């Protein structure tokens, strides 16, 4: 058939904001906040985003990091899953990477 069992760490998605990037911080604490999560002051433009969707042995944490697009000249929120599962991780990541009003 086919060969899987392919899967590295790496960012991938296509949410793109052309507004500046000191104003996503913002919002993004406003969305994380709003869907009952738990957001933690990191780096300078880093959060911890920690939610417990479902059951609390399966809590889901993501980064939030906002930098710059090395092929696109704009700003893209990346999502680094730290725990849970994939499913779980692009659970809650749907939520955001939509949500956010960017």
């Given amino acids: 058939g086919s060969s899987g069992s392919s ?3 790496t960012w991938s998605m296509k949410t793109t904001s052309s507004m500046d990037p000191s104003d ?3 919002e993004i604490r ?8 738990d957001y933690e002051q990191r780096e300078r433009f880093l959060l911890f985003c920690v939610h ?3 059951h609390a042995e399966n809590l889901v944490q993501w980064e939030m990091e906002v930098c710059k697009l090395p ?3 704009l700003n893209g929120v ?5 725990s849970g599962t ?3 991780f692009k659970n809650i990541a749907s ?3 939509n949500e956010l009003k960017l």
Avoid: H, P, W, Y
């Avoid at 406003?30 to 999560?37: I, M, R, T």
């Avoid at 990346?78 to 730290?82: L, P, T």
């Fill in 7 to 9: 899967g590295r760490f």
């Fill in 24 to 26: 996503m911080m913002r």
């Fill in 30 to 37: 406003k969305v994380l906040g709003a869907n009952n999560c």
């Fill in 52 to 54: 417990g969707d479902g």
């Fill in 71 to 73: 092929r696109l000249s």
């Fill in 78 to 82: 990346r999502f680094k899953r730290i």
């Fill in 86 to 88: 994939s499913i779980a």
């Fill in 95 to 97: 939520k955001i990477a």
